[PDB]
Amino acid sequence: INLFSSYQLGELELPNRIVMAPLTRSRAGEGNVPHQLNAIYYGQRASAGLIIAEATQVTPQGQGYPHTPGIHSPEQVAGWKLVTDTVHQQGGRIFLQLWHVGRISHPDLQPDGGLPVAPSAIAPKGEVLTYEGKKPYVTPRALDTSEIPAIVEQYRQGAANALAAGFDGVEIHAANGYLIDQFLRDGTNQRTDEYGGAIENRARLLLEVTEAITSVWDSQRVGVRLSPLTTLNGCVDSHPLETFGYVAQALNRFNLSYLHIFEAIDADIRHGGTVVPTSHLRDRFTGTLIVNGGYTREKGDTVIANKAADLVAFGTLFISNPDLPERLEVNAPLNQADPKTFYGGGEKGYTDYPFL
Numbered sequence: 144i145n146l147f148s149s150y151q152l153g154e155l156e157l158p159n160r161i162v163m164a165p166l167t168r169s170r171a172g173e174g175n176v177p178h179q180l181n182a183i184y185y186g187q188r189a190s191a192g193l194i195i196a197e198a199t200q201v202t203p204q205g206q207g208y209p210h211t212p213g214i215h216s217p218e219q220v221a222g223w224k225l226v227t228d229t230v231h232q233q234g235g236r237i238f239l240q241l242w243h244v245g246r247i248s249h250p251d252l253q254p255d256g257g258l259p260v261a262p263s264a265i266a267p268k269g270e271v272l273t274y275e276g277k278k279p280y281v282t283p284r285a286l287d288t289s290e291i292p293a294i295v296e297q298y299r300q301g302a303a304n305a306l307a308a309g310f311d312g313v314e315i316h317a318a319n320g321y322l323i324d325q326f327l328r329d330g331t332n333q334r335t336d337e338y339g340g341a342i343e344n345r346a347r348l349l350l351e352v353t354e355a356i357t358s359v360w361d362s363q364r365v366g367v368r369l370s371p372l373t374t375l376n377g378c379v380d381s382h383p384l385e386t387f388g389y390v391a392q393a394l395n396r397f398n399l400s401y402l403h404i405f406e407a408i409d410a411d412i413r414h415g416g417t418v419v420p421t422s423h424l425r426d427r428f429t430g431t432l433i434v435n436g437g438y439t440r441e442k443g444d445t446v447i448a449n450k451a452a453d454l455v456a457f458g459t460l461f462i463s464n465p466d467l468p469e470r471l472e473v474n475a476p477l478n479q480a481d482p483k484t485f486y487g488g489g490e491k492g493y494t495d496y497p498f499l
């Protein structure tokens with residue numbers, strides 16, 4: 144087996160092992176609604192074994208950056224259906240990444256100019272982009288215990304909206320220091336209720352969110368993404384091996400589509416070595432594993448052949464190469480990604496990277 148082998152993901156038949164990683168492109172229109180241009184972008188990439196669409200806020204409070212799309216309104220459902228229809232017409236498969244940014248936001252992006260919510264009242268460091276340029280972060284409000292059901296319900300409604308939008312499945316974003324990750328990691332979570340302290344408490348929001356989403360979706364169409372060794376957004380855990388190893392085992396109850404690991408590119412250089420080898424998680428999580436982070440044809444074939452992972456997601460290379468699968472398959476030159484046009488804007492650096 145290699146990166147071009149087919150794969151059975153529940154009832155979905157993937158033509159290859161190549162996944163398009165979720166990539167925020169900040170190109171939503173008024174009301175954070177997807178539009179035709181976005182449909183073209185994802186349709187261009189439909190040769191992917193599976194596309195995971197960009198992080199998409201499940202509720203207004205879950206937005207943290209200008210012009211990211213939502214999945215909380217009927218108008219957003221309609222705009223996403225343009226996208227899933229195009230991907231389906233092009234013979235592809237697409238899951239929606241369900242987001243809530245938690246503390247990584249600013250009042251200017253929040254309903255009524257209120258505070259971002261979080262497990263604990265810990266201000267991120269530095270500045271955050273608003274509609275009026277960069278502004279200092281404020282301190283988020285720590286959620287009351289009694290409010291956690293409402294967070295879980297916002298994710299359940301986000302998942303239901305994704306189903307109405309015609310996606311093939313959803314991915315729970317539990318990585319990169321956003322809301323669920325903020326609860327996971329003891330650096331961001333110092334709660335003294337059942338959602339803080341012990342690992343089974345820190346993992347509780349993830350597990351409750353997953354349980355609610357599997358009430359809407361068949362479980363084999365629900366994935367979870369973790370990023371055990373990122374330090375993005377000021378979110379770190381003091382015992383990542385035990386924390387993430389626990390989560391990989393706890394998720395098995397749900398019979399999920401997959402577990403997706405973003406392997407931080409800078410982890411070894413920082414952490415002075417390999418704190419959480421992905422093999423540790425591979426051995427604990429009994430389902431499909433997607434791995435991600437600086438993969439190539441050569442690196443992806445190896446992890447598949449070695450049984451270290453089942454699926455390989457590419458982020459950066461999918462920005463710049465719409466036909467990435469084909470290019471990898473024939474060892475074609477790859478287009479170089481232009482960082483200047485990753486976030487915001489229009490067609491330039493989005494739909495105008497050429498096919499082979």
Ligand SMILES: Cc1cc2nc3c(=O)[nH]c(=O)nc-3n(C[C@H](O)[C@H](O)[C@H](O)COP(=O)(O)O)c2cc1C
Pocket residue numbers: 164165166167168197198240316318319368405435436437438456457458459460485486
């Ligand atoms: C422009 C850009 C936007 C990203 N947006 C997301 C996101 O929406 N959700 C997410 O989980 N990761 C996101 N990431 C992380 C990527 O999915 C991916 O894990 C990372 O870029 C490493 O993979 P790569 O080396 O193949 O690019 C983003 C990365 C980039 C470069």
Ligand SMILES: CC(=O)C1=CC(C(C)=O)(C(C)=O)C=C[C@H]1C
Pocket residue numbers: 167198208318319375376
């Ligand atoms: C939503 C998301 O995960 C994003 C990832 C990053 C990244 C990998 O560096 C980040 C956490 O800042 C880039 C863009 C966003 C939104």
Ligand SMILES: [Cl-]
Pocket residue numbers: 186187188189190233
């Ligand atoms: Cl196509």
Ligand code: NA
Pocket residue numbers: 153154361363364
């Ligand atoms: Na199914």
